[PDB]
Amino acid sequence: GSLTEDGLSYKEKFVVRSYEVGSNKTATVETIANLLQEVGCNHAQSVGFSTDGFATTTTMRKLHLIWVTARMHIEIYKYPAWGDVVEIETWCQSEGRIGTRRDWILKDSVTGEVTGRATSKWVMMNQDTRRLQKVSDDVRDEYLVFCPQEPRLAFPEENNRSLKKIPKLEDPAQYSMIGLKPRRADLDMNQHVNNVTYIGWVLESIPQEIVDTHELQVITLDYRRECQQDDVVDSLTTTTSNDSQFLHLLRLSGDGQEINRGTTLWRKK
């Protein structure tokens, strides 16, 4: 992988592995989300971020600040097959004092066709108190160094799906998968649950018949609170809809505290 000629974005190619694919011999959406995180991490290393797993700037380290994910939104047109090469381009943008955004475009390396796109929103937090805060002038100045100054959006459309508000699922849920818990493979190098694990847990409550007859086209996931290593999670889903749409909720098994909410859109094969 490498920064592009202008140094404002980063590209990397991945060969899809045997264990990364599902029943149709194409990459799962969790494999896609892991590749998006990996290229994001390689881009951060290439522009001087800390190499301790927290991806912080110099000002952030001085002030004990970290970024936390607020939303992930992925749209896939074609999942790459086992052995195929996918090229992913990523870049960041500051959104004033609100937070920052990381965007991605996925392409078939042989054809050059766009096969998917993604966007994520991040908010600043004090690492010690876990309290949110606005982005300071010093941090916005650091982002100006390696971000395009004119807007560059993976989702340019007017009132596009990636910014839509998600409602809270009402009990009783139509479907559920109870008692989910992370194992060590679900943790990152800093012993926090990996963001991709929550996508897997959301999908656990989709019936196997939908997975067998449909392809996932869009997933939008809000993150509200982290699941700790000793927490247990319930995954709830209700149909809201040739397309099938669902509303999702992840909450702690032991008090019902919400940790995530989301929606998925599926197309019949």
Ligand X SMILES: Cc1cc(C)nc(N)c1
Interface residue with ligand X, options 226, 238, 240, 253 (CB under 6 A): 226
174-193 burial: b if 16+ Cβ within 10 Å, else e:
ebebeebebeeebeeeeebb
Spatial contact of 237 and 175, defined as CB atoms under 8 Å apart: yes
- If one asks whether residue 66 binds ligand X (CB under 6 A), the answer comes out as no
Query: Looking only at residues 112 through 141 of this chain, which bind ligand X when binding is defined by CB under 6 A?
Result: 123, 132
Q: How far apart are CA 246 and CA 160, in angstroms?
A: 18
Q: How far apart are CA 207 and CA 238, in angstroms?
A: 11
Q: Which of ligand X, a second copy, none does residue 225 bind (CB under 5 to 8 Å by kind)?
A: ligand X
- If one asks whether residue 17 binds a second copy (CB under 8 A), the answer comes out as yes
Spatial contact of 143 and 134, defined as CB atoms under 8 Å apart: no
Interface residue with ligand X, options 8, 63, 70, 105 (CB under 6 A): 70
Question: To 10 degrees, what angle do helices 195-203 and 29-46 make?
Answer: 170
The label of the residue with tokens 């019902």 reads 256
Examine the residue annotation and report whether 190 is marked as an active-site residue of this protein: yes
The label of the residue with tokens 């301790």 reads 52
Stretch that binds ligand X, among 82-90, 134-142, 219-227, 230-238 (CB under 6 A): 219-227
- If one asks whether residue 179 binds a second copy (CB under 8 A), the answer comes out as yes
Interface residue with ligand X, options 3, 8, 47, 68 (CB under 6 A): 68
Interface residue with a second copy, options 21, 32, 60, 66 (CB under 8 A): 21
Q: Which of ligand X, a second copy, none does residue 252 bind (CB under 5 to 8 Å by kind)?
A: none
Tokens encoding 252: 């702690």
Q: Write phi, then psi, for 184 (nearest 5 degrees).
A: -55, -35
The label of the residue with tokens 């490498």 reads 2
Q: How far apart are CA 130 and CA 166, in angstroms?
A: 24
Q: How far apart are CA 84 and CA 111, in angstroms?
A: 11
> Residue 44 or 259: which CB sits closer to ligand X?
259
Examine the residue annotation and report whether 64 is marked as an active-site residue of this protein: no
Q: Residue 202 Cβ, how far from a second copy at the closest point, in Å?
A: 11
Interface residue with a second copy, options 194, 220, 237, 260 (CB under 8 A): 194
- If one asks whether residue 267 binds ligand X (CB under 6 A), the answer comes out as no
Q: Residue 170 Cβ, how far from a second copy at the closest point, in Å?
A: 25
Tokens encoding 9: 């974005």
Q: Which of ligand X, a second copy, none does residue 106 bind (CB under 5 to 8 Å by kind)?
A: none
Of residues 192, 195, 214, 260, which has the active-site annotation? 192
Alpha helix locations (H) across 121-177? Answer: 137-146
Spatial contact of 12 and 87, defined as CB atoms under 8 Å apart: yes
The site for ligand X (CB under 6 A) is made up of 68, 70, 123, 132, 223-226
The site for a second copy (CB under 8 A) is made up of 17-19, 21-23, 25, 28, 30, 34, 37-38, 41-42, 45, 51, 53, 82-83, 179-181, 183-185, 187-191, 194, 196, 200-201, 203-204, 211
Give the catalytic positions in this structure: 190, 192, 227
